[PDB]
Design a protein around this ligand. Structure first.
Ligand SMILES: *[C@@H]1O[C@H](CO)[C@@H](O[C@@H]2O[C@H](CO)[C@@H](O[C@@H]3O[C@H](CO)[C@@H](O)[C@H](O)[C@@H]3O)[C@H](O)[C@H]2NC(C)=O)[C@H](O)[C@H]1NC(C)=O
Ligand SMILES: *[C@@H]1O[C@H](CO)[C@@H](O[C@@H]2O[C@H](CO)[C@@H](O)[C@H](O)[C@H]2NC(C)=O)[C@H](O)[C@H]1NC(C)=O
Ligand SMILES: *[C@@H]1O[C@H](CO)[C@@H](O)[C@H](O)[C@H]1NC(C)=O
Lengths: 48, 285, 283
């Protein structure tokens, strides 16, 4: 139960982006601002 | 018309310990059968507060600091505290907000008010009706004006014990003054009863003033104005960590201030109200 | 993956695209410390009127933040800055505009629309009549106006002008026509973002199906169905035991809904082998 909730709560890590939501970086940000921060949250979450 | 009193005295400053006060619903999010740990400008538990006994000549409304947000409470019998001036200089020199409950409406305006040196509700004592908003006379370069829906509140001089307890929480962010309200009936001899009582959001007020100070508009009572009996507090809101216990219906039932004592910090580490016997690791020093 | 079939766009009472003269048509703008409040409410807005104007030049939004709109009132605020103080108009970013004159909220954020007014709002000696605050006892919070036409105390002591070593809170901008762009006056409309909604239409509740949805304050895909969750009257939506939103009160009809996600899963393939047969069964 701790190992699942650790995996859950590291979704909410910003990893240097403006937020931890890929959809907010997708839809709200400008697309040049998007692709850099999509790149950050994947590299965070994939290695988490 | 800005008038004054025949005499203005300092309150009793009776010391009190606010146990479970200042708790509110911060967000719009329903959650149920859960336990949520967060931080906002809350009143901390067991807060050392003073009882502003306003009685018959005694009238405590000078400039009191706000700075991020204040907690207010008032055991009420005569319904004395019903208004608050917010602003910076409290003179006719900067933009200020006078939120009044004038026994009929909640009137809120954000202007450079011609502020009196004595902010009061000019109310006839024998029947509890207001003659004039003797807090301002006129106003300049306004940003906002609000009048709520109508009701009626009895604000005459009342005897006996305190029958009404209201809890208020104020803060400045994004131009929005947030004002929340808590309420319970009481039967109260002196300063305040202990107990857990939440607050719910009532006002979202894009006022746009530099809220650094506050003056509580008390209600003046004379048939040369005086006042009568109420006991109200001033508490401060602090960006502290709370646990928030949620029941089946999303009612906040209980809470823990994580920074009172090492027992309560341990509660926030375990994320429960139940702690087993033993040693648990907590934050480094 | 289960691919969705439906669009669920649920909003309160829908008006048209309003004309916004406060946004692109205003003639004279004041100084920034006492910025004029002009506001937008009850409009399905896109603010393409910021672009389609004979009165402006910049067209920059802090520009796909133009359509960042399903929230409360937009304040189309009116003021004149200098070119070296256009840059300080931002949420946070406390230079002399944001620290003391005009600070912006950062929940949503609109557009800072400015115009080169060198031939109108400036002079050869510096149009000093426009002024800005550089010193005040206390910082502004976001979305505040200072209308203090008052001589200022530089350290909180009784030292106001006309006494000596007592300072005015206002500097000249220096709107010089004989200089470059950094000293030029710009008439600035800022859409301060803190009820409008850009993508605001009305479709029907495609219940019990994997659908797309846009709600007031909520987007995503999922399965929609009525809910029993006891919303407080001051609650918009619900969240689960995780941090995912699972329930919402209908912005159109107040029907409390559940949002379960669309179905998905892995695939196994069962086979007795190619030497045995050439057929499979899937899980
Ligand atoms: C959340 O709110 C619901 C309201 O919908 C609460 O449910 C209500 O709880 C009361 C007290 O438990 C129930 O009253 C019971 O009535 C029976 C028959 O009259 C009586 O024999 C019992 O002694 C009791 O008084 C009421 O029926 C019930 N209503 C519903 C619709 O469930 C619920 O208790 C609240 N949650 C919590 C944790 O309190
Ligand atoms: C809360 O603050 C009050 C001051 O307003 C404290 O009251 C005094 O405290 C000092 C030392 O703590 C004592 O010597 C005085 O006798 C107290 N005066 C009165 C009238 O009580 C009070 O102690 C504070 N609360 C706590 C728990 O320390
Ligand atoms: C395929 O299965 C048969 C069983 O009847 C076996 O005799 C044969 O050797 C298998 N094929 C190969 C290539 O081994």
């Amino acid at each position: 139960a701790q190992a699942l909730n650790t995996l859950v709560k590291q979704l909410s890590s910003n990893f240097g982006a403006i937020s931890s939501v890929l959809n907010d970086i997708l839809s709200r940000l400008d697309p040049p601002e998007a692709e850099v921060q999509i790149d950050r949250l994947i590299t965070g979450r994939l290695q988490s | 018309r800005c008038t004054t009193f025949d005499d203005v005295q300092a309150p009793n400053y009776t010391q009190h310990t606010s146990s479970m006060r200042g708790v509110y619903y911060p967000d719009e999010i329903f959650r149920s059968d859960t336990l949520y740990l967060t931080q906002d400008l809350f009143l901390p538990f067991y807060s050392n507060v003073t009882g502003f006994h306003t009685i018959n000549h005694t009238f405590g409304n000078p400039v009191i600091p706000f700075k991020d947000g204040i907690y207010f409470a008032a055991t009420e019998k005569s319904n004395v505290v019903r208004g608050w001036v917010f602003g910076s200089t409290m003179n006719n020199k900067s933009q200020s907000v006078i939120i009044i409950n004038n026994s009929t409406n909640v009137v809120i305006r954000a202007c450079n008010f011609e502020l009196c040196d004595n902010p009061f509700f000019a109310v006839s004592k024998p029947m509890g009706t207001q003659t004039h908003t003797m807090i301002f006379d006129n106003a300049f370069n306004c940003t906002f004006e609000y009048i709520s829906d109508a009701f009626s509140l009895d604000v005459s001089e009342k005897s006996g014990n305190f029958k009404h307890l209201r809890e208020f929480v104020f803060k400045n962010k994004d131009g929005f003054l947030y004002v929340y309200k808590g309420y319970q009936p009481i039967d109260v001899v002196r300063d305040l009863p202990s107990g857990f009582n939440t607050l719910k959001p009532i006002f979202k007020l894009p006022l746009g003033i530099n809220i650094t100070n506050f003056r509580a508009i008390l209600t003046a009572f004379s048939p040369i104005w005086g006042t009568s009996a109420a006991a109200y507090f001033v508490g401060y809101l602090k960006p502290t960590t709370f646990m928030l216990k949620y029941d089946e219906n999303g009612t906040i039932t209980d809470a823990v201030d994580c920074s009172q004592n090492p027992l309560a910090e341990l509660k926030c580490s375990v994320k429960s109200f139940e702690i087993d016997k033993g040693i648990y690791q907590t934050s480094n020093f | 993956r289960v691919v969705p079939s439906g669009d669920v766009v649920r909003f309160p009472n829908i008006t048209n695209l309003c004309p916004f003269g406060e946004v692109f048509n205003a003639t004279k703008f004041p100084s920034v410390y006492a910025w004029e409040r002009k506001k937008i409410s009850n409009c399905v807005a896109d603010y393409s009127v910021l672009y389609n104007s004979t009165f402006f030049s910049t067209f920059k939004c802090y520009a796909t933040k133009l359509n960042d709109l399903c929230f409360s009132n937009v304040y189309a605020d009116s003021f004149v800055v200098k070119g070296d103080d256009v840059r300080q108009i931002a949420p946070g970013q406390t230079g002399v505009i944001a620290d003391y004159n005009y600070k912006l909220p950062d929940d949503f954020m609109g557009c800072v629309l400015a115009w080169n007014t060198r031939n109108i709002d400036a002079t050869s000696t510096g149009n000093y009549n426009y002024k800005y605050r550089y010193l005040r006892h206390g910082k502004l919070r976001p979305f505040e106006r200072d209308i203090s036409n008052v001589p200022f105390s530089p350290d909180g002591k009784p030292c106001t002008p006309p006494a000596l070593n007592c300072y005015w809170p206002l500097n000249d901008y220096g709107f010089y026509t004989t200089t470059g762009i950094g000293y030029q006056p710009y008439r600035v409309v800022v859409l301060s973002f803190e009820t409008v909604c850009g993508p605001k239409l009305s479709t029907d509740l495609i219940k019990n199906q994997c659908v797309n949805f846009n709600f007031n304050g909520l987007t995503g895909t999922g399965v929609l169905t009525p809910s029993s969750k006891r919303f407080q009257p001051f609650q918009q939506f619900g969240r689960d035991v995780s941090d995912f939103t699972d329930s919402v009160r209908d912005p159109k009809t107040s029907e409390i809904l559940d949002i379960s996600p669309c179905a998905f899963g892995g695939v196994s393939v069962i086979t007795p082998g190619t030497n045995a047969s050439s057929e499979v069964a899937v899980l």
